[PDB]
Each structure stands twice: as C-alpha cells, then as structure tokens.
Amino acid sequence: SVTQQVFNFAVTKSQPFGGYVYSTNLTASTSSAVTSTQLTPLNLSITLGQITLSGNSLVIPATQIWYLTDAYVSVPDYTNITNGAEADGVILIYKDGVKLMLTTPLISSMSISNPARTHLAQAVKYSPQSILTMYFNPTKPATASTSYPNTVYFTVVVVDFSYAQNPARAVVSANAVM
Amino acid sequence: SVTQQVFNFAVTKSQPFGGYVYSTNLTASTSSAVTSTQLTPLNLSITLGQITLSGNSLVIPATQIWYLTDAYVSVPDYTNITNGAEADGVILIYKDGVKLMLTTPLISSMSISNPARTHLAQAVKYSPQSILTMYFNPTKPATASTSYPNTVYFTVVVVDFSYAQNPARAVVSANAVM
Amino acid sequence: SVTQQVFNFAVTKSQPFGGYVYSTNLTASTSSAVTSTQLTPLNLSITLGQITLSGNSLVIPATQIWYLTDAYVSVPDYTNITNGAEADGVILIYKDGVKLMLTTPLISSMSISNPARTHLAQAVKYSPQSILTMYFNPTKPATASTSYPNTVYFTVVVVDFSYAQNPARAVVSANAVM
Amino acid sequence: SVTQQVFNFAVTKSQPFGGYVYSTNLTASTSSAVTSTQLTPLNLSITLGQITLSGNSLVIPATQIWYLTDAYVSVPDYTNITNGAEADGVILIYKDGVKLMLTTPLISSMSISNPARTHLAQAVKYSPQSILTMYFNPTKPATASTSYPNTVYFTVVVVDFSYAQNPARAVVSANAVM
Amino acid sequence: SVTQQVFNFAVTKSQPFGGYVYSTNLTASTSSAVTSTQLTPLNLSITLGQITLSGNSLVIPATQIWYLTDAYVSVPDYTNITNGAEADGVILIYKDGVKLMLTTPLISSMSISNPARTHLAQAVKYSPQSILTMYFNPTKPATASTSYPNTVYFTVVVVDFSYAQNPARAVVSANAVM
Amino acid sequence: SVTQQVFNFAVTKSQPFGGYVYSTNLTASTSSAVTSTQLTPLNLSITLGQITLSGNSLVIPATQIWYLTDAYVSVPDYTNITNGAEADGVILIYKDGVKLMLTTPLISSMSISNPARTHLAQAVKYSPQSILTMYFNPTKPATASTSYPNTVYFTVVVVDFSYAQNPARAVVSANAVM
Amino acid sequence: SVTQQVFNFAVTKSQPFGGYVYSTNLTASTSSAVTSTQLTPLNLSITLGQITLSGNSLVIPATQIWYLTDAYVSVPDYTNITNGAEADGVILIYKDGVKLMLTTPLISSMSISNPARTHLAQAVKYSPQSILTMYFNPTKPATASTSYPNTVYFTVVVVDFSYAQNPARAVVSANAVM
Amino acid sequence: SVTQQVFNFAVTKSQPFGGYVYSTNLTASTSSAVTSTQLTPLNLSITLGQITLSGNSLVIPATQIWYLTDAYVSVPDYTNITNGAEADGVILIYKDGVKLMLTTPLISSMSISNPARTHLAQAVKYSPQSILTMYFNPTKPATASTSYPNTVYFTVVVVDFSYAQNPARAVVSANAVM
Amino acid sequence: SVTQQVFNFAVTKSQPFGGYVYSTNLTASTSSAVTSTQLTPLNLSITLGQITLSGNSLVIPATQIWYLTDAYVSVPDYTNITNGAEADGVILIYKDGVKLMLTTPLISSMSISNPARTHLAQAVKYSPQSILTMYFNPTKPATASTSYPNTVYFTVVVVDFSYAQNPARAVVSANAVM
Amino acid sequence: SVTQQVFNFAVTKSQPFGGYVYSTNLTASTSSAVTSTQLTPLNLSITLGQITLSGNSLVIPATQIWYLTDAYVSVPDYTNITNGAEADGVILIYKDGVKLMLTTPLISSMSISNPARTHLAQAVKYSPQSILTMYFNPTKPATASTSYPNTVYFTVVVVDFSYAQNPARAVVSANAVM
C-alpha cells in the first residue's frame, strides 16, 4: 500500500486539470556481466503506445510527471546472485544527472522469493523534462563462469497530461500543486 | 482490506436506490503454454444466478457496476513460474477496448503466500455497459518441457440493480453519485 | 518500518533552510569469527562524496545530519547462524562515546527470510561532528569449525546541507528544529 | 505494540525529573541440559558499558527502573526444542523471591519466526532496589543425545536517573508518578 | 582573464535566484582523417555527474545555461598539423541551427605551444535547450600516410539551477536577466 | 591580477575583526606514473610553523578561510608532458566531497613560461572546516618509459583569525561579512 | 593522601544520625596474565565479621556508605612490571554500571617504592545498594614468558549504620547530607 | 595538583548547566622506533562507554570540553631512553592543527619516579569541536638494536554535556563561562 | 615590478624626517645541494659600509627600515634546475622568527630567462631591529650526480636615518607613518 | 611549579593587549671539546616557525618578551661528564653583553638522572631588544680521549606580540605593567 497512496494522491490532484494516471513497468538492466567496478544500466520504460523509451539517461517527456515507487528482483536473478553468476551491489538514483535521490538497499535482499523483502525509503518524483539516470555500484562481483547480466525491475506511476485542453502549461501548474 | 474500503463504499451509496452488493472472483487464464509473444487470456466471472460469462471481452450489463479491486496468483502456479514450467510477464488491463489503466507488476511477484506482496495499483471502477479486456505480455517465457497454461485470479465487487422498481433510473442516478 | 516516516520528517523540515534528504547504506562487520566475547564491528559508510569512511568510530561530517533507521541480514548469513557457522547476539549503538541509545534485537531475528522480520524502535539522530560507534555482544557464539565473520547492513537517512548559502549557519539552525 | 507504549510512556513521564530511557536485552540461561525437574536459570543483563550483570537474583540498582516487556526464543533454539534436543516448559517470573507475577506460556510456542507468536502477558515494572528472579518448570524434558542448555531472551526498558542531579529526589518523584 | 569575466558575471546574476555555477572542459573532435571536404566534429561534454552528452549537435538540458568561452589545441596535435598528419582549417560555431556567431581563427594558430596564442572573439552564451553544432572547414588537409583525427578542446561555464524551489521556468526567468 | 583583488579584499575586510592575511603555495602530486584511469593527488600545504599539512583531503582549520586563486605547472614538467614522460589531463576540485566547483583546463596548457597561459576560472573560497580534495582525470596518458609523477602548484590566500582574540566569534562574523 | 580528609568528613557528618566509621582493604586482581585487551578484575572486600564479599561487580550492603580513597601496588608486582612479567595500564572505576567516575593513574606509577607515589584525584562516594565494578585497560602488555596476574590493592572508608535507633531511616537521611 | 585546581574548577562552573566531569588518560604513542626525523604519534583516548578513540587527530565531539592537564613517562620507558633503546626529543601540542601552544621539555626528563620532575607548562583548555594533534621532534634518536616505540602518557579532564536537557544550548552557554 | 613604487614611496615620506633611500643586493644561498627536505639559506647582505652581514637571521640595524621588493634567478642556475642539478621549490620569508608573510612563487618561474618572469606580490616591511630569516621548501629536489647549491638574489630598499638631528628619535617616528 | 607561575603571570597580563604566550626549548652547546679556558656556547632557540635561531648572542626581537626559567642536563651527557669525556663547570648568563645576571650551579649537578637535582635562583626576564649571550667557564676539563661537546637545555617562556592590532606600542605598553 505504498504505491496505492501516491496513486490516490495523483488522481485527486490531476482531476481538475485533466490527467491520465496509470501505472507502468520500468526495467533497468546492466549489460554484459559486471565484474570490476561501477557500471551503467540501460533504463527501459514502456508507455501506452508500445513505445520503448530505452537507452541510458532517460529524459521524462514534456507532458508527464513520474513517480518511482517500488523495486523487486525476480527469482531466477536471485538464484544467479547467490550462486555467483551475477554481481550483488546497490543502485544509485540520480535526478538531472547531478542530484542524488536514493540508494537501493542491496538488490539481492529486495528479491521477491523472501517473505520479508526490503523496501525503498521514499517515492521519488520526476518533473517534466529531467534526466533520470542510474548507476550500479557492485560489491562481491561475478565469480562463476558463464555469468549473466543483471536485471532490476521498478514500478512507476505515470501521470500523463497530453490530452488536456492545452497540454503545455497545465503540466507545470499541476507540478507545483503536487 | 482495500476491497473492504470499496465494499463498504458500495453498500453505503447503492442502498437508497436499492442495490444488491456482493463480491465474486474472476479468472483470467492465458491458454495453452504461452512461450513466444503477446497473447489474450479468457476472462471468466461467476455472477449470481448459476451463470458463468466466459470468453474474451466481458460486456458489462446495463444494470450492473463492477469493481476490479485485487489480484493474486495461486501457490502451485508460483511454484511453476519459478521452475520455468509456465511463463512470467505482466498483464495489461483495458477499458472499452481502448483505454489502458493498469499494468500488474510481474505476476511471479504477486503470489499470495508472501505477506510482502505487491498488490494492484488502484481499485478500477468499471461503469455500466463497457468492455473489460486483458492481455498478457510475456517476459521470461516458459522454457521447460510439459509446460502449463497461466492463471491469474481477480476479486470483483459487483453492484446490481436488476431487482429494483425501475432498473433504468436507478442505475443512472447511482452511477453519478457512486 | 520507521524509515519511511523520518525520511518524510527530514524533507519538510530542511526545506526552509535548504538541503538534501537522501539515503545510503552502512555496513557493520565484526572481523574474524567471534567465539568468546564482545568485539568491535567495523563501520563502513559511503556517501555522495565517493569517500569511504571505514574503520571503527565514524565521525559525522560538519554539514550532515545522519539518521540510523533500519537493519537487515542476508539469507546466507542467516544460514550460517543456524548451523553455528557464526555467532548470534545483539548490536549496541553508542553516541559521543558516552551514551548508549539502542540495542538491535537479536540479528538472527531480523533476517530477511523470517516472515516476522523485526525492525528498530526509533530512528537515532546524529548531529554535526559526533561519534557513531557500535559494539557486538555475542550470545550463543560460533561452535562449528571454519566459521565466518558477521555482517549487518544498516540504513542511514543523510540530510546534507552543502548547497545552501552558508552551510555553517544553516546546519546549526536545522539541528535545533529537528 | 506493547514495548512501544511502555517506551513512549517512560520517555514522556521521566523527562521533567531528568531521565535517560533506553532498551536492552536480558538472557535467561538454564545451563547443563535440564532433564528431570524444576531448575533456576542464570539471569544476565547487558547494560551500558559492557558490564554484563550476571548470575541469579539480579538486584536492581538504586537509581534505575526496569520494565520486563516481551520475551521470545530464538529459531535454532526452537529447532532444538522440536527435535527434543533441549527441554520444554514454562518460566515463572518472581518479584522479591516470594511473589509470583507471570508464567510464560510454553517457551516452544513463542519462537520469533512465527507471526502468530504468543506474547508475554503484561509489562512488569521493577522498581528500585528489588530482586528479579525466575524459575524454569519443565514438561517433556530433553530426550535426545547431545543435549543443549536453554536460552530465553527478554526485553527490558531501563530508565536511569544517575546522571540528572541528586538522584534520590528524582527516583522517588518519578517512582511516585510513573 | 576573459573566462573569469563571464564567470563572475554568472555567479552574481544567478545568485538571487539560486544557481550553482562551475566550469567544464568540452571536447570537439573530427573523426577519421579529414582529407578533402567539409566535415563534422563530434561534440562531447561531460557534466559533473558523469553523464556524457555525446554525438553531433548537443542539446542543452532544461535547467542549465551554458557559456562557451575559450578554445585551444594541445601540443601532440600541433606537431601533427605542421607535419601533415592532420588537417588545418577553421571551426564554425552555431546555435539553434540558424545563427552563426563565431569562426575560430585557423586552429593551428590556436595551439598552446606558442607564447602568443590567439583567442576567440566573444564568449557565446547558450540558453536552455538549443542545438550546439560545429563544422570543420579545412584548408591544407592531411597529406602524409598514417593520418590522425583532429581534436579541439573548449572551456564552457555551466550555470545550474537544479537546487532551487522552482522548476525550469525560473531558469528562463534568470535567462531574461542575463 | 586576479590574486591581488582577493588580497586587497582580505586585507580590507578582515582588518577590523583582527586578521592576518598571507599567501602560500599548495602542491598537488599525483604519484607513481599515472597511465590508465582517474587517480587521487597527494595534497601538501605549508602554512605558518612548518606543519606541512600533507596527504589527501586537507581539512581547513576552524579558524581560517582559504582562497584557491591560481594554478600552474613548472617548465620541466611541461617538457615531460609534451614528450610523453608524464600524463596530461584535467584536475577536478571538490568541496565537502560532493560539490564540484572547477575543472582545470588541461594542465599542459597552464605552463608558467607562456605569457598566454590560461588561468583558473575563479578564486574558490573555502570556509571554516570543510574537506578540500582534488582528482586527476587523465586524457592522453603517459606513454614513454621512465615516466614521472605529476605535479601541479596552486596559490592559496590564507586569512587567519586564530591569534587575534577569541577566534570563533571573529571567524563567524568575518565569514558572514566577507 | 586524601584518606585523612574524608575520614574526618565521615566521622563528623555521620554522628548526628548514629555512625560507625572504620576503614578496610579492597583487593582487585585481574586473573591469568592479561596480554592483549581490556580485562575484568575480581574484586574482594573484607568487612568486619569474616564477611568477604567476592566475585565481579560487588553490591554494597543496605546500611553502609563506602568511600574509595587510594590505591597502592606492592614491590613483587613492580619488579614484574618492569621485567615484562605482567601488564601495565590503568583501572576504570564504574558506579551503577553506567557512570564512569575515575581512572587510576598508571598502576606501575602507584608502586610502593616510587618516592613520588601518585595518589587519586578525589575519593568517590558510594551509596547504599549500588554495583561497584572495575575494569583494566592494559597499555604495553605482558610480553615475556611465565607471566603473572595483576593485583592492585585499594583503601575503602566504610560508614556503617547498624547500631542506630532505626537502621533504615538513618541511612537515607545521612546519604543525602554526606 | 594542577589537575585538582582544574577538576574543582570544572565541577563548579559546569554544575548550573548540568554537566558530567570526569578524568581519563590519553596515550600518545609514536609507532615503530623513530630513528631519523620528525614523526607523528597516535593519540588514544579512553572515553566512558568502553570506546578507544584511536588514530591521529582526535576530534572533540560537540557536547564535550577537554582539558590537557599533565604529562609523564612510564619507568620502563625511561629505562629504555637512557640506555639508547628508544629515542629522546620534545613533543609539540597543536590546536586546530595550526596554533602551537606548548612544547614539552625533553620527555626523558619527565619520568614519574623523580620528585624533581618538570611538569607540563600549563593546563590547556581544548574548546568544542576542534582538532587535537601532536608531533614528536626527536633529538638523540634510537641507536641500539632491538629498539622499541615511544609512549608518553597524558591526563585529560573531560567535561561532558550530553546528558543535559538540551545538549546544544548547554555547551554554548558553558563554553563562554568556563 | 613593485620595486620602483616603494622606492618612490620611501623618498616622499622620509623627507619630513630626513633620510637616505637607496637600494642594495641580498643573496640567499642554501649550502650543499638540497635533496631531501627543508633547509636554511644563508643570507648575505652588503650595505654602504662595505660590510657583509653573513649567516642566518640578519638583524636590521637600529636606524634603518628595509623593504624586500623583488627577486630573480640567473640563467646558469636555471639551466641547472631543468637538468636536475639543483632543487626547485619555494622560499618562505619570516619576520621576528614567528610570522610568515610571503612565499616566493616557484624560483624557476622568477628566473631571468622566463619571458613571463613573475615578481613578488607586495613589499615586505622591516622596522628597526627585527629578525629577517628565510627558509627553502624543496619540491622536486635534486637527483643528478654532481649537484649544485641554490642561489636566489633579492633586492632590498634601505631607508637610512643616520644623517638626521638624532637618528634614534627620527626612525621611531617614521616607522609609524611608513 | 616555577615555570607554571610565570606562564600564568604572562597570560594574565598578555590578555588585555593581545599576546601569544607559548613555551619553547633553548639549547646552548659549547662546540668541540673544551679543554683549557672560557668558551662561548652556540645558543639555539626553536620558536613556532621551527626557526633554528642559531649563532652566538641571540637578539630578542622588538615584539617579544622572553623568560629564561629552567635548566637541565640529559642522561647521556651526565654519564660523559663523570667519565671525563667532556668538561664540567658553570654557565654565565649575560644581559646585553654587559650585565651578569645569574650563574648556573655546576652543570654536572643539574643533571636529570638524580632525583633531587639543583635549580636556578630566579626567572630572568628579557625585555625588547637585548642581546642574550652566554659563556661557559670550565672547571675540571675533559681528560680522556674521544671527547664530546657540552650541551645544556633551557626552557623559555616567550610572550609574543607580533599578531596584535598594532605591534609597535602594545609591546611597550605591556612591558611596563609586567
């Protein structure tokens, strides 16, 4: 009931200005078998129109207000972490490339097969256009042969404004009142 | 008890117009071992009078209001996802065949045995007559031999006005307030 | 479970003075296989400064206000505890070398694999320069041959003030109101 | 939440007289593999300064107030109990060596891993100088070979007054109010 | 002392609105051995949080104001220009894809090994998002075998508004004062 | 004459509070033939008394205000740079570990034998206690055998208040004014 | 040297309430050849009638007020300290477990054959029932073979109240004025 | 008795604000057999809660006031100095790393056995948070084989305000008075 | 460059009191090939008396007011620096044996052959009798065999007062006004 | 406790005018094996700036007030005087080269190896500018071969005034009241 509170906060504020609140799934994936030092995962979001906003350092579109709210790791990735087939570590979340926002507590320990997995500390918002970039700082890297790249899922509440009566300036008038 | 916030809201508003409020369970089953790409699951609700609306794209009757409130996965299915005996992925939830409203976070995550299980994002009101349709976009599909089809359960609160004095002007007066 | 409330407490208090609120990860580790008596865990914090504060007895920098919030234990540490490969016990938390303000409840009982994973009582403040130091009081020490050192990951809420007008005047005014 | 009400009550009440409230852990250890009849467990409290007040019949010092709030049994101890590697039974909690106040319900049942763990009945206040002592009444003793001593953990809220002023007036005034 | 003239202008004009001014080294490099005609150097600016804005025709992020101030040529380039290992020529500097504002005076004469290096004509400011592209118009191109690409270093002053209490409309409000 | 305005400002402003202004040299030595990646230079400052404040991360004393004004490179070091006996690159200047304030423009370019030597962009003020640290990012690193360490000299304007009166009130009043 | 001032202070204040003042010898001895880290000495007091309170953490009787005044070290210890047969260091003196009240100045410098035999600073008053415990902090520990335990004798001024008209109401009225 | 004039000064001034006064022993130990030139000893204080503030450059916490009162040398060190087994010299005592306050007169002279031992020159008040560091400038260094490191003991009176009602407002009102 | 202004300042100010103004030559030379650490240069001043003032620590005579203005390094020294025949570094200028007021900027860069020969920032005053003394701080010291000592020539403006009515009362009246 | 009185007398009088009281160490060394007649020792004070103020007949600078308060002779010197390896005798202490102020009693008898060594008679002050010079008048000179020079350490309290607001008549105002 952590994402259900920012969702319910969004739909009562985006209603008098027009606003299409819906939830998506964002997948950050560090490419090709991290073994030494700080690397860069490829952010990859899925909006409505089957459009894959991929590549490093996503810019939020000019009419959307995002909220990064949750994270979890699948079972076949967690079975690769403890067996030494992919690296453990944390994930650093940067806003505008400069300002640090959060740090994920040890992606092996927010796996989904454990009944008391750890959480994030806050729901990180992102205004109209800003540069979301993430970095994966590894500890205890990959040791076994035929190792695998990392994958960490997120969950974004997306507040769209493209279908308002004038989708140019309501998206920052509603950015202030939020 | 996010259903019980919706349940106690439906008994409170649909009572002066006369209205039968009860909860039932909807079954969306992607058939025959999804292994490649986007498919479409068969919705199957259980309404009151011994009838079962099967098939895709459930049409809401003109005297009823539905509410999709929660979702989970059975424990023998969560055994089969992590074993590679059936496919993982997300579920897209549409309204009137067009409007995307939800994306369930990676159905391996919402197994009912975990107390730290990520739920649905928000309770979706489904109006009088309006098409409910779902799709299943697979990621990490089924790999092992003797695979099984997928099943994802839902909890639906159904409000009914077919036993009032006038079923027409009871619905159109309660759909605006509630 | 308290780490979401003191994060929201530092945001609405540091905004008139101006300053970050973010989170990081702190690792405490008693070296080399405790089997007899009270040993010293090596604190190790990383900040946005990209400088690792290692060894015992961390000193909080002059523009930051730390908040010690939660703690967890990974699964292969918890498999070591039940097999006697490492020691159980509690962790004591000191301030300024004199005061003792907490006790972590039995580091096996806060493992990530217990469905009743227990948390801390209240968040511990740390003003500009003060001394964070910890001690491990082992009950039921390690019995098996080829033991392993302990590791308990903490969670800090860090309230930076480095980007104000003058952080020497700002950080001692927000230290009073928080 | 029975320790938290006691903790907030002790922080609110013992503040204006000057009072240092914290929480520690108490260990009751029935040594040497009890197999026949009623024994006496060795108490051991770990206070500030690694003093480790050990042995039977802990005399509360003349400036502190103790609050025996909750009790549990660690998970390897529960594994040893249900395999018959250590004895089961109840724990009798006495004040001044004559007056009985509590009997803990069957220490196998209060393992910390269960969410349905039976708690202690009430938070027992121990005033300045007074003799806490406990006894262990065993039912179904240890039958398997390589038996282990019993260990039961308690949680104490220590309210110290030595640092404030003349501690005599502070202790008698706080003991009058709270 | 022309870089320090607009740097001091930046820190006194973006200070009442809140603005974090700093300097940054920029790189523009014509790839793979220009030999006949007009080419295009690949820009590369590294803002502080290790995001690398690369490729031709950079876009300015939405909260920053840039000032392109200095340019020079390193000594391993200048030994290669006069020996016919790479091309001479000029560099044209555009903004918004329409405006020409500068031409660098014959980059071999902008080398740093000469005690009378010639400078640019004016410090070119750069608004929030506006395309910054450069072109290499060579005279006397590369002659000898084993030719090398060109490299021309710049020096840009970056004003940053990431830490204010207003979104990217205070940035253009401070672009109206500068 | 960028150091002289800082000197006249420190003489004029710090005189009524009692203030001893002088100028000194700081040496940054990146040791042991940097050839691959980003390294850390050994700082070494010589204030009054032959204290030789050495090592990384010089903390400013709690009674002084520093002013990093200019930087240069000695002429045999420039000879070693242009022949590939030591690495070229930039130096990033940090305050309190997080705040990047300057990047020195390509230390080969700031040889002291050139009258057209590029300077720093601004004289950076360091308040009372704060962590001054630098980093060396090499571009076109050292290639020839028998390589040499890098050395970059800075000019510091030290404004001392320790010998005047009670130095705390004086240094905070001065840091408020100038 | 401070014993003669508090003995005259004891016999003056304790006579209006009934007062029975004498002195005795306390023996503190860390067992078994301290060589690495902080040890716990075994206290042993000698009261009147073959009442030899022993073990760690002595508890004061309910009718007496102790005063810990001086200490000394015999010659067969001091010839073992200088030859490396036992450890040097200081002794820490606690009260109620929490307060640290003194530090004995370097037990090899309190020997009975030093012509400048150092004494304690002020005598520490000990109330009715209150845990007196000590701790030994070794610097330059034992290095030679066939090492020996430590023994440091003290001097206690005991103010007994057993022969007053009421031995309970007399002490807590004289403990307030002494 | 220069400490007893300071100890009775600290308990008189810090009493209306509420403040813990006690004495400890600080150890300055130059590591590993100084034989050539100026070195730096490792300061090592022993505060209340069993901590050992080791390492160079002791930082005073924001609630404490320190007083450096005397200095001496243990008798097995004085035997090693005069036989040429460790080095002689003086000791410099700095405040905030810059301001020299004392120079101890030739540490071979201040042996604790001589009644005509030259003491420290003055009792130095060390203000709240402020660096303490020492250096050892040797004359007649260590010559004999199997040499040993140095150790010079100090006596520190610690005034502590961490147990007052407001530890911020207590120190800054008592640092001015005391 | 300042040596013509302080000459013209000294002439127009001493004429109400009557006095010589003339310029001399000061030679500071470290003995015997500095290769490791901080050495002492031997000052050697010549005056109108045909009198050398040799050795360290020149004392200004009782009726003169000196002014240390500029410095330079001859070409046969500057060819020795680049070939590693003597040490680089800076020269510190002390007054009264306590105060530091200048640091000469890198004696290679004030050579007579550098086209940007740098000067001293401001002139150093010296009253009636005070102790001028200097120290040489070597960075990048001499490595080559058959090394050479350093020699750095200065320029002193001498204000003699021996031709007034009384040279003792005149020089203490002009020392205040100049 | 003789130097601690003149140190306290200085800081009570140097406080209202400004002033930096600190303790030093003076080393007088009659060079190269005095065997016949009256010699002159090389005085050598070590001030704050690590200034080796060498040479015969030190001059007190115009802003300092010294106090010669102590003398002692080390243990390796005293074993050479009795062995006939260097000369015994007294040291004459002259003011301005004219006045005789004191005479030390037989420098072999102010050794530090003896528990009740002799002292000086009075603490000799020194005003602004005056010539402190010493002479060594030997009785019983060195007799055996391989002789050594003499060395006698002193202890100077130096009252400095160079950092006052006007160090020209503050030192002549405080010279009167002292």
Per-position DSSP letters for F3-33, written without gaps between them: HHHHHHHHHHHSTTT--EEEEEEEEEEE-S-
Distance of CA I107 to the CA centre of its chain: 13
- What are the domain boundaries of chain E? 1-178
Q: N- to C-terminal Cα distance for chain A? A: 19
Interface mutation vs chain C, best among E163, E165, E166, most C CBs within 10 Å: E163
Token digits for J38?
A: 């009256």
Q: Which residue of G has its CA nearest to H159?
A: G101
Tally of CB atoms within 10 A around B151: 20
Contact partners for chain B, using 3 or more CB pairs closer than 8 A, are: A
Of H49, H50, H163, the CB nearest to D163: H163
C vs F, Cβ pairs < 8 A, gives 36
Chains H and E touch (3+ CB pairs under 8 A): no
CB I40 to CB J53 under 8 A?
no
Closest CA relative to residue J23, chosen from J44, J35, J7, J36: J7
- Residue A26's φ and ψ, nearest 5 degrees, are -110, 135
CB A25 to CB B90 under 8 A?
yes
| Angstroms from C129 CA to nearest CA on chain D | 22
Q: Which helix (H) or strand (E) holds C151?
A: none
Chains I and F touch (3+ CB pairs under 8 A): yes
What gap in Å lies between CA J120 and CA J123, rounded to an integer?
Answer: 8
Helix axes D75-82, C75-82, angle to 10 degrees: 50
CB I114 to CB F75 under 8 A?
yes
Token digits for G113?
A: 């054959």
| Count of alpha carbons within 13 angstroms of residue E148, beta-carbon side | 15
| Count of alpha carbons within 13 angstroms of residue F135, beta-carbon side | 18
Please give the DSSP secondary-structure letter assigned to residue G123.
Answer: P
Of F22, F27, F76, the CB nearest to I100: F22
Please give the DSSP secondary-structure letter assigned to residue G39.
Answer: B
What gap in Å lies between CA H17 and CA H99, rounded to an integer?
Answer: 30
Q: What is the 3-state secondary structure (H, E, C) of chain I?
A: CHHHHHHHHHHHHHCCCCCCCEEEEEEEEECCCCCCCCECEEEEEECCCCCEECCCCEECCCCEEEEEEEEEECHHHHHHHHCCCCCEEEEEEEECCCEEEEEECCCCCCECCCCCCCCCCCCEEECCCCEEEEEEEEECCCCCCCCCCCCEEEEEEEEECCCCCCHHHHHHHHHHHC
Which residues of chain G have a CB within 8 Å of the CB of D162?
Answer: 95-96, 98-99
Please answer whether residues E90 and E113 qualify as being in contact, where contact means their C-beta atoms are separated by less than 8 angstroms. Answer: no
Token digits for A144?
A: 């076994």
Task: State the method.
Answer: cryo-EM
Q: Tokens 């030559």 label which residue?
A: I25
CB J51 to CB I129 under 8 A?
no
What are the residues facing H160 on neighbouring strands?
H20, H64
Q: Tokens 């006369």 label which residue?
A: B18
Chains D and C touch (3+ CB pairs under 8 A): yes
DSSP of A60-91: PPTTEEEEEEEEEB-HHHHHHHTTTSS-EEEE
CA separation, residue F24 to residues D15, F8, I41, J91 (Å)? 53, 16, 18, 42
Which residues of chain A have a CB within 8 Å of the CB of E159?
Answer: none
Q: What is the SS3 assignment for F95?
A: strand
Please answer whether residues A103 and A43 qualify as being in contact, where contact means their C-beta atoms are separated by less than 8 angstroms. Answer: no
Q: Provide residues of F within 8 Å CB-CB of chain I.
A: 3-4, 7, 20, 22-25, 27, 46-48, 50, 72, 74-76, 79, 112-115, 117, 151, 153, 155
Closest CA relative to residue H107, chosen from H115, H116, H97, H118: H118
What gap in Å lies between CA J122 and CA J133, rounded to an integer?
Answer: 17
Q: What is the SS3 assignment for F169?
A: helix
Closest CA relative to residue J56, chosen from J129, J134, J130, J155: J134
Of F88, F113, F121, the CB nearest to E4: F121
Single-letter amino acid code for the residue at A99: K
DSSP of C16-44: TT----EEEEEEE-B-S---SS-B-B--E
Q: N- to C-terminal Cα distance for chain D? A: 19
Q: Which helix (H) or strand (E) holds F122?
A: none
Breaks (C-N over 2.5 A) in chain G follow: none
CB G108 to CB H72 under 8 A?
no
CA separation, residue H9 to residues E69, F139, H4, H21, H157 (Å)? 63, 61, 8, 10, 11
What gap in Å lies between CA D164 and CA H21, rounded to an integer?
Answer: 13
| Region for D19 from its dihedrals, namely left if φ exceeds 0, alpha if ψ lies in -120 to 50, beta otherwise | beta
Single-letter amino acid code for the residue at G34: V
DSSP of H3-57: HHHHHHHHHHHSTTT--EEEEEEEEEE--S---SS-B--EEEB--SSS--B-SSS
Closest CA relative to residue E171, chosen from E62, E13, E78: E62
What are the residues facing A137 on neighbouring strands?
A90
Closest CA relative to residue E35, chosen from E103, E152, E136: E136
Which residues of chain C have a CB within 8 Å of the CB of E11?
Answer: none
Single-letter amino acid code for the residue at G135: Y
Of E23, E112, E115, the CB nearest to F121: E23
Which residues of chain G have a CB within 8 Å of the CB of D160?
Answer: 96, 98
| Region for C154 from its dihedrals, namely left if φ exceeds 0, alpha if ψ lies in -120 to 50, beta otherwise | beta
Please answer whether residues B30 and B136 qualify as being in contact, where contact means their C-beta atoms are separated by less than 8 angstroms. Answer: yes
| Count of alpha carbons within 13 angstroms of residue A172, beta-carbon side | 13
Please answer whether residues J86 and I88 qualify as being in contact, where contact means their C-beta atoms are separated by less than 8 angstroms. Answer: no
Buried b (16+ CB within 10 A) or exposed e, C64-101: bbbbbbbbbbbbebbebbeebbbbbbbbbbbbbbbbbb
CB E49 to CB A97 under 8 A?
yes
Buried b (16+ CB within 10 A) or exposed e, J101-130: bbebbbbbebbbbeeebbebeebebbebbb
| Count of alpha carbons within 13 angstroms of residue I71, beta-carbon side | 28
Helices (H) and strands (E) in chain C, counts: 3, 10
